[PDB]
Design a protein around this ligand. Structure first.
Ligand code: GDP
Ligand code: MG
Length: 156
């Protein structure tokens, strides 16, 4: 009846904002439904970050929908890391910053978008049971992230 969830992913992808959005319903860590949420720092921390993983029931592996590099780093860095420290714990893959992907003006001002179908193909590649695209800014699908997280750990 407890669920430790650890959020991981590159710098600036939106991990802390994701937790603030879910828990506080605002945009600048625990919940009860009928869930402990851990934040991490995503290279200086290579040795210390993994310490947070012990007894994790699920990982939220975030990458940014506006950043091809964070997309590439899921397979390059994060998967190898989680498999070393916590093989077998399920992964919910989250593409953050959905509000920016929607906005043509963002790419004029700035960035390479990741499509829903490409996020889905990455999901399959890493064996994640879930892939959710979300925006902490608009809050869209943020509740969905954590609802996936609980569904994927709880029996059935
Ligand atoms: N537009 C937009 N900006 C975001 C979103 N999530 C985070 N940010 C911005 O991205 C930056 C990094 O967010 P932060 O949560 O601190 O990322 P973290 O390093 O992964 O923890 C901040 O400038 C945020 O305001 C989002 O959904 N939409
Ligand atoms: Mg943070």
């Amino acid at each position: 009846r407890f669920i430790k969830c650890v959020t991981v992913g590159d710098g600036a992808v939106g991990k802390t904002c994701l937790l603030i959005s879910y828990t506080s319903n605002t945009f600048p860590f625990s919940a009860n439904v009928v869930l402990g949420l851990w934040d991490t720092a995503g290279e200086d921390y290579n040795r210390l970050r993994p310490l947070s993983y012990r007894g994790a029931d699920v990982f939220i592996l975030a990458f940014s929908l506006i950043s091809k590099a964070s997309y590439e780093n899921v397979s390059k860095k994060w998967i190898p890391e989680l498999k070393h420290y916590a093989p077998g714990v399920p992964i919910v893959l989250v593409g953050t910053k959905l509000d920016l992907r929607d906005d043509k003006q963002f790419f004029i001002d700035h960035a390479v978008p990741i499509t829903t179908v490409q996020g889905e193909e990455l999901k399959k590649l890493i064996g994640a049971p879930a892939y959710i695209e979300c925006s902490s800014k608009s809050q869209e699908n943020v509740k969905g992230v954590f609802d996936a997280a609980i569904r994927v750990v709880l029996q059935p």
